[PDB]
């Protein structure tokens, strides 16, 4: 995984500490970035889950 600021991620564990912004997608040979296996598939899941987190009657 590549960060937005030209940085690669060695261990997939800095995710837990904070939210990170990644580089956009492109098909150029010199600058090639591809969508992740789980990219965009948790949209409704994230919406419902954040809705659960925000409410505090619970």
């Amino acid at each position: 995984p590549k960060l937005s600021n030209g940085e690669l991620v060695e261990n997939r564990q800095i995710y837990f500490n904070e939210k990170l912004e990644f580089t956009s997608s492109n098909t150029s040979k010199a600058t090639k970035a591809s969508n992740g296996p789980f990219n965009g598939e948790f949209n409704r899941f994230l919406s419902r889950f954040e809705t659960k987190l925000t409410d505090k009657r619970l």
């Binding site: 409704r44 919406s47 419902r48 954040e50 809705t51």
Partner: protein, 58 residues
């Protein structure tokens, strides 16, 4: 006395519309007079209102 009525194909307007001299104020909220701010809306309903699916959503 507190009664609230959710009536598709409104029919009970005449049942309570007695003469004005009897002092029975009835507030008739018809589609013209409803004031429902869209910004009081949760996740699911905002997505449903401003989003369709139809094709495979890009």
């Amino acid at each position: 006395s507190h009664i609230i009525i959710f009536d598709i194909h409104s029919e009970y307007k005449s049942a309570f519309e007695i003469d004005k001299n009897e002092d029975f104020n009835l507030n008739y909220l018809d589609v013209e007079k409803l004031k429902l701010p869209y910004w009081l809306m949760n996740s699911e309903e905002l997505e449903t209102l401003f989003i369709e699916s139809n094709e495979q959503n890009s």
